[PDB]
Amino acid sequence: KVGRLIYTAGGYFRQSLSYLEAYNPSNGSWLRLADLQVPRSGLAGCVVGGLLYAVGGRNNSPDGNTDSSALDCYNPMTNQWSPCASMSVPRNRIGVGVIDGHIYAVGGSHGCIHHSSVERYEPERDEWHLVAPMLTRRIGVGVAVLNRLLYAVGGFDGTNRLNSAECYYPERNEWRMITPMNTIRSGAGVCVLHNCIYAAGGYDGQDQLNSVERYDVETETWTFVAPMRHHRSALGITVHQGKIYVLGGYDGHTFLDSVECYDPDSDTWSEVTRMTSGRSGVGVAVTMEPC
Ligand SMILES: Cc1cc2c(cc1[C@@H](CC(=O)O)c1ccc3ccc(OCC(=O)NC4CCCCCC4)cc3c1)OCO2
Ligand SMILES: [Cl-]
């Protein structure tokens, strides 16, 4: 369990960013590591077999905007990024979940297309394959895995921001709707802690949110928990040592450098550190420290 860092990749401030930085919750330290080959915001991060994966996003630059189908893998042992097989389609504002060593890429946009499509990556074969699409097109979708089931939460379908959510059952290759959230949320941070799927922040169509709600898979209910100290949309999120960490985002005025930590035992959020600069739209994941 020791020696794990919170990695933040990419993001957005004025333009899409190539930063890879790692935070050590045990000593407060930040490390700047190998840049992404291509700056990207709206990407997702995940970890399989100790490798950090950056999936999709968009390169926003003064010389254009390209939605990304890329899957790039970072090895902390080498501090090197390597290209992996690309997805079938570009996916900006994607969500990602891992089940049994496989990466699921969910939704996202390509130009004006809002995807319902979903695809699954097999590291052992370096191949992607499409699976059943969601019941709703979703960009800015939050994705988490609980009990080897994949959840897609909120987002924007091209016309409406969503409070709906749905669950993918891999052995049936089938999506089913679940209880909708109490709040419409696009660009929320979604993760799993204990038996619950948490949805923190986001945009409801009018304001950035500091509210946080959690879905109990047993009771099929969403319940609000303590709100964040800051309103945040397009925030990064991960879980580390039984706590939720939220990184950055946009509060309606500033791109935040704040990192907050939620303790479920006290139902409190605390400010724990600041990123090296404010940004939104980052990919976040946890893996061993580099060398
Ligand atoms: C969440 C959101 C907030 C907004 C908004 C549009 C959205 C949605 C889309 C929607 O509701 O159609 C959204 C959802 C998920 C995202 C995930 C990543 C992501 O990275 C690129 C990025 O970081 N851009 C930033 C520039 C400043 C304003 C836009 C949002 C932040 C963007 C995301 C955007 O318009 C202004 O506030
Ligand atoms: Cl964008």
Swiss-Prot record:
Disruption phenotype: Early postnatal lethality caused by abnormal cornification. Mice survive until weaning and probably die from malnutrition resulting from hyperkeratosis in the esophagus and forestomach that cause gastric obstruction. Defects are caused by constitutive activation Nfe2l2/Nrf2, leading to constitutive expression of phase 2 detoxifying enzymes. Mice lacking both Nfe2l2/Nrf2 and Keap1 reverse the hyperkeratosis phenotype and are healthy and viable in normal conditions. Non-enzymatic covalent modifications of reactive cysteines by electrophile metabolites inactivate the BCR(KEAP1) complex. Accumulation of fumarate promotes the formation of cysteine S-succination (S-(2-succinyl)cysteine), leading to inactivate the BCR(KEAP1) complex and promote NFE2L2/NRF2 nuclear accumulation and activation. Nitric oxide-dependent 8-Nitro-cGMP formation promotes cysteine guanylation (S-cGMP-cysteine), leading to NFE2L2/NRF2 nuclear accumulation and activation. Degraded via a proteasomal-independent process during selective autophagy: interaction with phosphorylated SQSTM1/p62 sequesters KEAP1 in inclusion bodies, leading to its degradation. Signal peptide: none annotated. It is found in: Cytoplasm; Nucleus. The modification S-cGMP-cysteine is found at residue 112. The modification S-(2-succinyl)cysteine is found at residue 291. Changing residue 161 to A: Does not affect interaction with SQSTM1/p62. Abolished interaction with SQSTM1/p62. The record marks 112 as: Sensor for electrophilic agents. Kelch repeats lie at residues 5-50, 51-101, 102-148, 149-195, 197-242, 243-289. Component of the BCR(KEAP1) E3 ubiquitin ligase complex, at least composed of 2 molecules of CUL3, 2 molecules of KEAP1, and RBX1. Interacts with NFE2L2/NRF2; the interaction is direct. Forms a ternary complex with NFE2L2/NRF2 and PGAM5. Interacts with (phosphorylated) SQSTM1/p62; the interaction is direct and inactivates the BCR(KEAP1) complex by sequestering it in inclusion bodies, promoting its degradation. Interacts with NFE2L1. Interacts with BPTF and PTMA. Interacts with MAP1LC3B. Interacts indirectly with ENC1. Interacts with SESN1 and SESN2. Interacts with HSP90AA1 and HSP90AB1. Belongs to the KEAP1 family. The Kelch repeats mediate interaction with NFE2L2/NRF2, BPTF and PGAM5. This is Kelch-like ECH-associated protein 1. The chain holds residues 323 to 613 of 624 of the full protein.
